Amino acid sequence: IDNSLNTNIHQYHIVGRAIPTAKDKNPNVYRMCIFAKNDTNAKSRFWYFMKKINKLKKSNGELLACEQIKERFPLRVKNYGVLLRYDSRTGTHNMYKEFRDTTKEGAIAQLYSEMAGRHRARASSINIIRISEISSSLVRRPHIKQLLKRRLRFPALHLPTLQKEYRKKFASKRPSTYRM
């Protein structure tokens, strides 16, 4: 396993409920899966959303479940469409973005990186709504559409990334970026 390669976004399924009172005996139980670095951040986000949508806060509520969802097939490549709400420096906008990779967590990490790089949207300004697998038929973004051809092949024009050991300072002759 390569920790440098591995991000640390995980999907957590969290179930909670308001503490039963005299006013109501069986409060409705709220369930949601969210993405966070760890279960503590996941619970914090769950309670934030409980307060925002329902009138239920950590103090008047109790946890019922907090587990981690693991991808069934972490080595199958699948296309994800994720709905999104984020606020900019001047307003709030919803956008739908597509990715494709093995795990929903990897897709979400991709989304965070893309949002930061393109719209300078920090993670605190992002609210993930409805990330879900989408079939190849209804993929919408062209940069994902072009990745689903019947036979995909291209060259490897990337520059070499050698080990630090062999990244020697003085070279005997000019290396070739042409490769192959």
- Segments in 5-103 forming alpha helices (H): 39-53
Residue 160's binding partner out of other proteins, RNA, none, with CB under 5 to 8 Å set by partner kind:
other proteins
Given the complex with RNA, which of 22 and 75 has the nearer CB atom? 75
Write out the residues near other proteins by the rule CB under 8 A: 2, 4-5, 13, 31, 33, 37-41, 43-44, 69, 75, 77, 100-102, 122-124, 130, 132, 143, 146-147, 151-165, 167-175, 177, 179-180
Q: Choose between 25 and 89: whose C-beta lies nearer to other proteins.
A: 89
Question: Binds 119, which of other proteins, RNA, none (CB < 5 to 8 A, cut-off by type)?
Answer: RNA
User: Could you tell me the CA-to-CA distances from 43 to 51, 126, 144, 162, 164 in Å, in that order?
Assistant: 12, 17, 33, 41, 40
Taking the complex as a whole, the smallest distance from the CB of residue 90 to other proteins amounts, in Å, to: 21
Residue among 58 and 102 whose Cβ is closer to RNA:
102
171 binds, among RNA, other proteins, none (CB under 5 to 8 A by kind): other proteins
Tally the C-alpha atoms within 13 A of residue 7's C-alpha that lie toward its C-beta. Answer: 17
Residue 68 CB, nearest approach to RNA (Å): 8
Measured distance CA(177)–CA(156) in Å, rounded: 11
Measure CA 107 to chain center.
Answer: 5
Question: Which one-letter DSSP state was computed for residue 74?
Answer: T
User: Which listed option, other proteins, RNA, none, makes contact with residue 33 (CB within 5 to 8 Å by class)?
Assistant: other proteins
* Structure-token match 């290396």, residue found: 175
- Asked if residues 59 and 33 have their Cβ atoms less than 8 Å apart, the reply is no
